[PDB]
Design an enzyme around this catalytic site. Structure first.
Site, PDB file in Angstrom:
ATOM      1  N   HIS A  72    -117.377  57.884  16.567  1.00 57.11           N
ATOM      2  CA  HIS A  72    -116.950  58.473  15.259  1.00 57.11           C
ATOM      3  C   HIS A  72    -117.322  57.603  14.054  1.00 57.11           C
ATOM      4  CE1 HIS A  72    -114.414  61.708  16.943  1.00 57.11           C
ATOM      5  NE2 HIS A  72    -114.244  60.847  17.953  1.00 57.11           N
TER       6      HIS A  72
ATOM      7  N   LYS B  71    -108.531  62.753   1.423  1.00 58.19           N
ATOM      8  CA  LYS B  71    -108.990  62.035   2.628  1.00 58.19           C
ATOM      9  C   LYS B  71    -108.340  60.653   2.589  1.00 58.19           C
ATOM     10  CE  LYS B  71    -113.173  62.707   1.045  1.00 58.19           C
ATOM     11  NZ  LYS B  71    -113.916  63.204   2.225  1.00 58.19           N
ATOM     12  N   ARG B  72    -108.398  59.914   3.686  1.00 59.47           N
ATOM     13  CA  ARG B  72    -107.823  58.548   3.744  1.00 59.47           C
ATOM     14  C   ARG B  72    -108.514  57.663   2.677  1.00 59.47           C
ATOM     15  NH1 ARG B  72    -104.405  57.045   8.156  1.00 59.47           N
ATOM     16  NH2 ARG B  72    -104.527  55.051   7.043  1.00 59.47           N
TER      17      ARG B  72
ATOM     18  N   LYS C 195    -115.448  55.593   1.289  1.00 62.71           N
ATOM     19  CA  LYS C 195    -115.250  56.987   0.822  1.00 62.71           C
ATOM     20  C   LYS C 195    -115.359  57.039  -0.713  1.00 62.71           C
ATOM     21  CE  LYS C 195    -112.201  58.680   4.646  1.00 62.71           C
ATOM     22  NZ  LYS C 195    -113.214  59.517   5.330  1.00 62.71           N
TER      23      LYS C 195
ATOM     24  N   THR D  45    -114.866  66.278   8.150  1.00 63.68           N
ATOM     25  CA  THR D  45    -114.423  67.645   8.472  1.00 63.68           C
ATOM     26  C   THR D  45    -113.746  68.265   7.242  1.00 63.68           C
ATOM     27  OG1 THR D  45    -112.490  66.663   9.417  1.00 63.68           O
ATOM     28  CG2 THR D  45    -114.303  67.335  10.958  1.00 63.68           C
TER      29      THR D  45
ATOM     30  N   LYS E 126    -113.867  72.223   5.664  1.00 68.92           N
ATOM     31  CA  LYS E 126    -112.686  73.007   5.217  1.00 68.92           C
ATOM     32  C   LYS E 126    -112.908  73.546   3.805  1.00 68.92           C
ATOM     33  CE  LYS E 126    -109.971  69.828   7.965  1.00 68.92           C
ATOM     34  NZ  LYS E 126    -108.780  68.963   7.852  1.00 68.92           N
TER      35      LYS E 126
END
Ligand SMILES: OC[C@@H]1O[C@@H](OC2=Cc3c(O)cc(O)cc3O[C@H]2c2ccc(O)cc2)[C@@H](O)[C@H](O)[C@H]1O
Ligand SMILES: OC[C@@H]1O[C@@H](OC2=Cc3c(O)cc(O)cc3O[C@H]2c2ccc(O)cc2)[C@@H](O)[C@H](O)[C@H]1O
Ligand SMILES: Cc1ncc(COP(=O)(O)O)c(C=O)c1O
Ligand SMILES: Cc1ncc(COP(=O)(O)O)c(C=O)c1O
Lengths: 811, 811
Positions: free
Chosen positions: B352, B543-544, B549, B651, B655
């Site tokens: 992952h 998101k985290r 990110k 993911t 969505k």
């Protein structure tokens, strides 16, 4: 099959089978093909619990709308045992469920063996609480049991190498189908912090919070449609909180440790902080519940004692007195004087023992730290109480010292018994001899200040669990003669004296005993591969292992019996199976040695080919409520042999009497009232009375005198010392020998001779089965006084100010 | 009310009301008069769960009798969210339950808000597991989720003074009506001890035992009557065991701490012993279950890989490889070579992430102590694996060092990724760009040894939870045009390209968005009294919180927008609500600073009267699955702005695309495949590609260059340093400034200019609502590839060797 078990109506049976199968499918999510006996037990439990639910909701809504005085029985122990059979008996469903399960191809009694005891108590005090809940529901009282939902009850006892080993009693492993979690009614309890005094008086600040989550269990009355509630609190860490995030989540365990485990001390005070936290936890949560229920009722705290009774089972929930004062003064802002008037009219105290080692005397430093506001309130209670003492007994300074709630010494302590007497309108002992002793000795000063405070409430046992459940055979032959009203009116057993010459009843009483003994023999064989001679006198001492209960005196008799056989092998003696069982508190060394001595005697006696099946000594493993229900109906002789003055009451004595055993005992606790009820000619009474123990204390107990003058005693002490009963560890029992010869507070040797001779009379009567059975009938027929329904009616009328009722609720 | 929600049949509705009322009475033991909304939620949950039960028993008995190959998805995370709505959707009961509750006077959507998230995961890997369970059931696979029943899931996030505070996620406080305790199938797991080598080879002895108690939760397929099982293990102290009895009972906590709490690290390896114990706990219990189920089936372990697939979600359950070898060699007594052949054919591994900080590298000393036999087996695996490497690449000694399962250094460690590749017949990345990177870089050596091992399985999301549940409005307007087959055949959304010029569909797509935004605005108002301008572009990054990110890059744009308004107040700009949410791992200091910077920007921007409602920045508290289901259907712009090469897949991107948002993103993870599916003209792609990041790494990333050459960037860095966003703590953001200027591994400044310009194109398109909506239709219509049904069918055919089926089970 049996009348007293009720009707198997075709409709009742078809519904139960339908609901059984519905629970197996939807509740257990199991197919008939994969389902274990454990699944079948749970399907039956859920089916039987469904029958409670309508009555449970209606009872509580009846109390809401009718608003009677509520009784709160606060106990740190509810020794409930199994619930499935008791529920079927009290709803009249036993024969229907039995038929329903039989038609399903299942043995209901095998299913019953799967249920875990709710072992949330140590012994008598715990079981008394449980009997009381049953009787209050049967007498239609608006009564609530309040306690702690221990994750682990009293330890499971294993015997390994003849020694007690303790295992954790994981009673919730497979769930509890009886209780309903009520997490919505969770309440905060406070610990530590400090007191600030402001313009609005005292505030308790900077506390740690522990949440109390209630679990409600139904308590069904006998066929009266009443279902009361036992509310048990579970400890939960609050919502909001150097090892960081992970360690702070794991540290939730410390607050949750409050409801983790029952302190396994019977009649002994261990001053552990965690025990103090359990005591405050149950008191703080319970009193918040009581106050909330009081405020939301049909209408000022003046009326509070007309709507609330708090009964304190021992000093364990004694903090209810200062806690009620804290809420009334600090939160409701009442004057001290009015708050105190309310508190004393609300609270009453039950004492269960006179043994000094049992009394709660909490270090002042511990209370200072844990409960700073409670200590301040206790000091103020003490000042005002001693002011009333000084006014009644001016210049009696020693009386002031003896009566104080504060005990001076290296460690200053609070006497919780003194707090209870000061803060309660009623104080009771649990048998007439004990209640008188309280007035004459340990509470003499308090009795002189307030004589109308001091009462007696002789203990009882519920004839549902302790006759109809455990001994359906005996319930049946009684009902066949006098009908069923005795089951909630136990004084009707007196009608049985009319049958003392009836050959049929005499035959039937001996037949039921014989059946109980074959069933207990078979249980011992199935579960433990232990063989007993069912044509032997079953001689049974079951209760917690203690020096005061004198399991050791029973031990000296068993060895006397063994030594007489070896001396005169050809001489006929009545065969005996001597059965002793009970748990030792884990840290009580002498109690653990006594268990080891019983098994060591067995290791010699049970393998001597000269003795064969004429004498057997066995230690019954893991004595608990479910095992009491099996062995007590099988007993011929009930051992109740406490040193006179030491057993406040006993309740095991009353169970044995109800179930067709004869009693060998001292004039101690309720043994005195049982002998008065049956006639002393129908009891095997022996040994010193209280006055004889006192005379021996006055000139000094010298055990060596007895050893020097009794050859048979000397032989036995010499077998113990020389290693006869521990050949590979010859000094193993030095501690028992040394305590008996030099430190014996319970005067074992002083009753040895009268006990052995009284045991000879027991055997003599046993050789005449007709007269044994006639004496048994005279015992059963006079056991009615010992119903907990009688005990509770007295509490209700003489302490709580409420009237019992056998009249039924409408559905 | 809505077609896709199914039929409210008069019979269905009357039954549901009947069962609702039955559960309220018998299950909750509540009267209509005392019942809280929480009771009503539980009555509905129990009623809906009853509808699972027949299908759940029949599915499992169908797998028993038909004996297909079983798929075991091993994950230390199942990020399931709420179950009530998902269950009603998959059984076609949503309209009936809605009607049933309405007739009862209840709002079903208020009831749904009472359910606790099953928050048993961190982020994408956890949610992937959950989407996969749903898709495997929908494709009729004989699949089992195996994990840990954490008492506490991912922490509840509070924002206090603009800072993250962590609270315990007490998700089981009111119970879990979905799960079934299976304490009867409890299994032992071993820790510590040592290995003795005897004549019968190795034995693992002197272990501590922890019991694993399984809890089974139903997993319903979409209207196919299939109900699979998620089995989660709970840690329990064994039956039999200086602080004495009380402390030994309290010490049961230490073994039970194994299932207490989810490690809250997203994409980061913390080598805590307790984490290692959780990994072995789930592997040891699960593999015992698998072996037992294998032995009790229609017929030697040769057939084991034809009846068993073990899928390893990341390296977390990597110990399954040596554990399976331990059971096959030490317990079943297979030869090493046959055991290894079986193990490799059974196991497959999903990677992952490529970030080095995420890789599991357990100290050898820890494995030596905790799992001595597993370390011995890992050494033997390593020797035989490196023997095959030496034979394929003779004399390549550095390749031997790079590929070893053993990493040398001050602390010798086991590389769990190397163990997984060696012990698995298949290794997959989670998007084409990531799977290629794996072959080119971190697993290049392994790819060269075994090229056929290495696969791609592009991630997906379930269109049940992520369209029909969360966005019924959009599900409805799609079904009105193309019918309902798309719900389990998402490639049919391509039919929507036929409507890109249809004025009605264009109107309806914009209307559903508008409704979603008003519903999210109202939620924000109700729960938090936060006001947002519903006529603003909803710009959403959820998101985290991580440096990779680049929440910080979003932060630099928000301040650019604020600074441009202050410079030219009169200049029109498209109003925005900029929404950022996500949890920081408790020990990740930079992540916690970034949350504080988002709130600090809000404290200036949201109170500047020159800005008013033209710009708002808000931090969404407690981002979790249930909050994703509310905000993602309300989003206009999806922020997917990871440094190219760092997001394996994502993911959340998929969505947003399914729910009618346009995407601004880098060519990273599945963003590349999403842009390929819709056409790049329908995506706002900006920034460095992987090759441009690599070129910058080659000559060295100097952030000062960007600061020196971009006046607008310099102004913002100067506002951060000088205290513009922390006036009372002017140096508060020194750490962020210092990381950006000197230590930035994610090259924030290097994408600043392209990002701001791409954001200008977004606003330009938003001013043309018709063309915005037409571009949205082109996105939705091409999102079908991103269904988890597609992902799972690929796993089933290319790794597990099993054929999917949409065909229904018969009842
Ligand atoms: O009765 C006398 C006392 O007995 C033992 O200690 C305990 C007493 C006791 C008891 O008499 C009855 C009980 O049901 C329980 C008892 O518990 C302990 C005890 C001592 C140590 C511990 O670890 C905990 C409790 C003796 O070990 C102790 O020295 C002595 O004070
Ligand atoms: O990413 C770089 C690391 O970040 C921080 O530590 C953690 C990293 C981390 C992460 O990058 C993503 C996560 O989801 C979680 C993370 O947890 C920690 C961490 C450090 C200390 C702890 O008490 C626990 C974990 C830093 O505090 C640490 O110095 C650094 O090594
Ligand atoms: C399990 C159990 N323990 C203890 C007691 C109390 O017995 P005794 O009065 O003999 O101590 C009873 C009654 C009981 O059922
Ligand atoms: C609550 C939650 N967190 C995280 C993710 C993963 O999102 P992303 O791919 O943007 O990290 C999802 C999906 C989700 O629902």
């Amino acid at each position: 099959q049996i009348s007293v078990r009720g009707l198997a109506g075709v409709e009742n049976v078809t519904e139960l089978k339908k609901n059984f199968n519905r629970h197996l499918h939807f509740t257990l999510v199991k197919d008939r093909n994969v389902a274990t006996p454990r699944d079948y037990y749970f399907a039956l439990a859920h089916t039987v619990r469904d029958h409670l639910v309508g009555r449970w909701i209606r009872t509580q809504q009846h109390y809401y709308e009718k608003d009677p005085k509520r009784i709160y029985y606060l106990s740190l122990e509810f020794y409930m045992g199994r619930t499935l059979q008791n529920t079927m008996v009290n709803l009249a469903l036993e024969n229907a469920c039995d038929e329903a399960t039989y038609q399903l191809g299942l043995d209901m009694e095998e299913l019953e063996e799967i249920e875990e005891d709710a072992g949330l108590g140590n012994g008598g005090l715990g079981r008394l609480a449980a009997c009381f809940l049953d009787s209050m529901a049967t007498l239609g009282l608006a009564a609530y049991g309040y306690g702690i939902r221990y994750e682990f009850g009293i330890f499971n006892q294993k015997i390994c190498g003849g020694w007690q080993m303790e295992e954790a009693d994981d009673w919730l492993r497979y769930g509890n189908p009886w209780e309903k979690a009520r997490p919505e009614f969770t309440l905060p309890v406070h610990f530590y912090g400090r007191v600030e005094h402001t313009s609005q008086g005292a505030k308790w600040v900077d506390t740690q919070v522990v949440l109390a989550m209630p679990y409600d269990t139904p308590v069904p009355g006998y066929r009266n449609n009443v279902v009361n509630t036992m509310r048990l609190w579970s400890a939960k860490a609050p919502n909001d909180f150097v090892g960081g995030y992970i360690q702070a989540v794991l540290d939730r365990n410390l607050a949750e440790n409050i409801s983790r485990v029952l302190y396994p001390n019977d009649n002994f005070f261990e001053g552990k902080e965690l025990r103090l936290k359990q005591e405050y936890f149950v008191v703080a949560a319970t009193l918040q519940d009581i106050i909330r229920r009081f405020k939301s009722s049909k209408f000022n705290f003046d009326a509070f004692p007309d709507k609330v009774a708090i009964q304190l089972n021992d000093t364990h929930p004694s903090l209810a007195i200062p806690e009620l004062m804290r809420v009334l003064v600090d939160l409701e802002r009442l004057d001290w004087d009015k708050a105190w008037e309310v508190t004393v009219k609300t609270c009453a105290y039950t004492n269960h023992t006179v043994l000094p080692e049992a009394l709660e005397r909490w270090p002042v430093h511990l209370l200072e730290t844990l409960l700073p506001r409670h200590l301040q309130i206790i000091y103020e209670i003490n000042q005002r109480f001693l002011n009333r003492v000084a006014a009644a007994f001016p210049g009696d300074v020693d009386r002031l010292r003896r009566m104080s709630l504060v005990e001076e010494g290296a460690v200053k302590r609070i006497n919780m018994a003194h707090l209870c007497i000061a803060g309660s309108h009623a104080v009771n002992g649990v048998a007439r001899i004990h209640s008188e002793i309280l007035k004459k000795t340990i509470f003499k000063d308090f009795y002189e200040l307030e004589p109308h405070k001091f009462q007696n409430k002789t203990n009882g046992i519920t004839p549902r669990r302790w006759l109809v459940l455990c001994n359906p055979g005996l319930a049946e032959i009684i009902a066949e003669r006098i009908g069923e009203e005795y089951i909630s009116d136990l004084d009707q057993l007196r009608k049985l004296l009319s049958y003392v010459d009836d050959e049929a009843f005499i035959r039937d009483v001996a037949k039921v005993k014989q059946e109980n003994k074959l069933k207990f023999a078979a249980y011992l064989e199935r579960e433990y591969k232990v063989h007993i001679n069912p044509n032997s006198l079953f001689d049974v001492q079951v209760k917690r292992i203690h020096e005061y209960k004198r399991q050791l005196l029973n031990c000296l008799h068993v060895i006397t019996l063994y030594n007489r056989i070896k001396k005169e092998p050809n001489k006929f003696v009545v065969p005996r199976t001597v059965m002793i069982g009970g748990k030792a508190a884990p840290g009580y060394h002498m109690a653990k040695m006594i268990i080891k001595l019983i098994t060591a005697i067995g290791d010699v006696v049970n393998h001597d080919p000269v003795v064969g099946d004429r004498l057997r000594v066995i230690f019954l493993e893991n004595y608990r409520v479910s095992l009491a229900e099996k062995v007590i109906p099988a007993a011929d002789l009930s051992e109740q042999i406490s040193t006179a003055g030491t057993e406040a009451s006993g309740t095991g004595n009353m169970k044995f009497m109800l179930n067709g055993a004869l009693t060998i005992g001292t004039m101690d606790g309720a043994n005195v009232e049982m002998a008065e009820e049956a006639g002393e000619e129908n009891f095997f009474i022996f040994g010193m009375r209280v006055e004889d123990v006192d005379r021996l204390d006055q000139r000094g107990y010298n055990a060596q005198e007895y050893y020097d003058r009794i050859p048979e005693l000397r032989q036995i002490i010499e077998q113990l010392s020389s290693g006869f009963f521990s050949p590979k560890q010859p000094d193993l029992f030095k501690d028992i020998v040394n305590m008996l010869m030099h430190h014996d507070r319970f005067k074992v040797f002083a009753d040895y001779e009268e006990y052995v001779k009284c045991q000879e009379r027991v055997s003599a009567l046993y050789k005449n089965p007709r007269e044994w059975t006639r004496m048994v009938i005279r015992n059963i027929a006079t056991s009615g006084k010992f119903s907990s329904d009688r005990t509770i009616a007295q509490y209700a009328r003489e302490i709580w100010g409420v009237e019992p009722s056998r009249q039924r609720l409408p559905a």
